[PDB]
Design a protein around this ligand. Structure first.
Ligand SMILES: [Zn+2]
Length: 256
């Protein structure tokens, strides 16, 4: 029964998920003056040309676009990663207002939203096993600012009417996640966690330096979703972000 409200939100999560207070929790503030350039990091390899989207679901926390991860169709490798990580889903975190919504911050700056492309280490055979390993996941984080429309996001925005409430899903085939990427693959990377319960410390975070621009109308449509199920009182799905967690004993490395 975790959520983002006064009574079940991030300040409460540690009671059911004591790892909430652990040594590698996400997200974090990225202090751009403290992050060290690591000239030994490889270019990120994003290979999404055979990505097969299945469906889009409102899970009462965000909406997830799910992919067929039964072969190496859409993979992330290189950068800080050893081996091959398979895309399983993406989702976003967003605000009630354009001045908040992102989970990661950059020199304490909050973006309007953050996209998370979730990938799992193929050496662990399935997603559920991967989340129990310290190198099990690679999450590609992309900031969203409000400006010009992102044409490659509009197919997502258009289906949100059909999944307004918790538990609603829709067919979402032939969606090309390449249309969500900025021009530059320059990134920061650090070891961290899932930013929602169960907050497992299984994530290599790769956060892109260059945000994508979306329109105010595109972000407004995210804000019209519901955390509640059909027939329950309307709670708008806004402010579904975890605030920045203590960096503790961690170095953020820059690719640039
Ligand atoms: Zn996320």
């Amino acid at each position: 029964h975790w959520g983002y409200g006064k009574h079940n939100g991030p300040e409460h999560w540690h009671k059911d998920f004591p790892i909430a207070k652990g040594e590698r929790q996400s997200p974090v503030d990225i202090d751009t003056h403290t992050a060290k350039y690591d000239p030994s990091l490889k270019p990120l390899s994003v290979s999404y040309d055979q990505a097969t989207s299945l469906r889009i679901l409102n899970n009462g926390h965000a909406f997830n676009v799910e992919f067929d991860d039964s072969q190496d169709k859409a993979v992330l490798k290189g950068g800080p990663l050893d081996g091959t990580y398979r895309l399983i889903q993406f989702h976003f975190h967003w605000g009630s207002l354009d001045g908040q919504g992102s989970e990661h911050t950059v020199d304490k700056k909050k973006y309007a939203a953050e996209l998370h492309l979730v990938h799992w280490n193929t050496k662990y055979g399935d997603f559920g096993k991967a989340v129990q390993q310290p190198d099990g996941l690679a999450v590609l984080g992309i900031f969203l600012k409000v400006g010009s429309a992102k044409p490659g996001l509009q197919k997502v925005v258009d289906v949100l009417d059909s999944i307004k409430t918790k538990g609603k899903s829709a067919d979402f085939t032939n969606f090309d996640p390449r249309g969500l990427l900025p021009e530059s693959l320059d990134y920061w990377t650090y070891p961290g966690s899932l930013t929602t319960p169960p907050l497992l410390e299984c994530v290599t975070w790769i956060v892109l330096k260059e945000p994508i621009s979306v329109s105010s109308e595109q972000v407004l449509k995210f804000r019209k979703l519901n955390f509640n199920g059909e027939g329950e009182p309307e709670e708008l799905m806004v402010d579904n972000w975890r605030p920045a967690q203590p960096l503790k004993n961690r170095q953020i490395k820059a690719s640039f």
